[PDB]
Write a protein that binds this DNA or RNA. Structure first.
Ligand SMILES: [Zn+2]
Ligand SMILES: [Zn+2]
Ligand SMILES: [Zn+2]
Ligand SMILES: [Zn+2]
Ligand SMILES: [Zn+2]
Ligand SMILES: [Zn+2]
Length: 170
DNA sequence: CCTCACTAGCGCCCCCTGCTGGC
DNA sequence: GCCAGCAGGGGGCGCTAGTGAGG
């Protein structure tokens, strides 16, 4: 009906094509009055003000005081209350509570390592791992833990925990 | 018919927390 | 003990199909 002169994508109304072309290029007309961001549509600008400026969180959790801006988050929050596991893995028996978390799990079966350190060019599976690598291996005078019993230095908190559970038996 | 708003809904990515197990 | 893999509970954005309201 209304195709895109850049890709084969098609839409039914003109406003959709107008927004689709406003994504191929940076032409975000809905500008935020309280910060320096902009968006192609209004709905994208609405929530940006409710995330950062007005903190308007409509979706409430009936079990706790949690509140989310989008319903997608609450549906995910409530899963940890009921233990749901809707997203099943196709290659193993792991199930998730968030479609993107399942995408991260697949890096176990594929061996993919997208993130690499910008200093030593060492690669990792998760963006948090890399951030830790830079802290422990490329930062100067980093604070380190200390066992108050045996007087041994440990750099990571988790290592101190397992030190107490193994050597000192909690 | 045609706009333009509002609402659900998928997707993307990152954070921080905390553990495991090879070296 | 160091190191990287790896799962939980979260925040903020990219983009679009569905509904009506008013030209
Ligand atoms: Zn296109
Ligand atoms: Zn803003
Ligand atoms: Zn809750
Ligand atoms: Zn799997
Ligand atoms: Zn490095
Ligand atoms: Zn000790």
């Amino acid at each position: 009906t209304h195709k895109c002169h850049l890709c084969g994508r098609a839409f039914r109304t003109v406003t959709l094509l107008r927004n689709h072309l406003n994504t191929h290029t940076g032409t975000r007309p809905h500008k935020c009055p309280d910060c320096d961001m902009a968006f192609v549509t209004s709905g994208e600008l609405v929530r940006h003000r409710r995330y950062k400026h007005t903190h308007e969180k409509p979706f409430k959790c009936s079990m706790c005081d949690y509140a989310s801006v989008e319903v997608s988050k609450l549906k995910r929050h409530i899963r940890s209350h009921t233990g749901e596991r809707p997203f099943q893995c196709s290659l193993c028996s792991y199930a998730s509570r968030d479609t993107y978390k399942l995408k991260r799990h697949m890096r176990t079966h594929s061996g993919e390592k997208p993130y690499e350190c910008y200093i030593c060019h060492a690669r990792f599976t998760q963006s948090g791992t890399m951030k830790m690598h830079i802290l422990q291996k490329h930062t100067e005078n980093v604070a380190k833990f200390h066992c108050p019993h045996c007087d041994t230095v440990i750099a990571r908190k988790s290592d101190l925990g397992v030190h107490l559970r193994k050597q000192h038996s909690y």
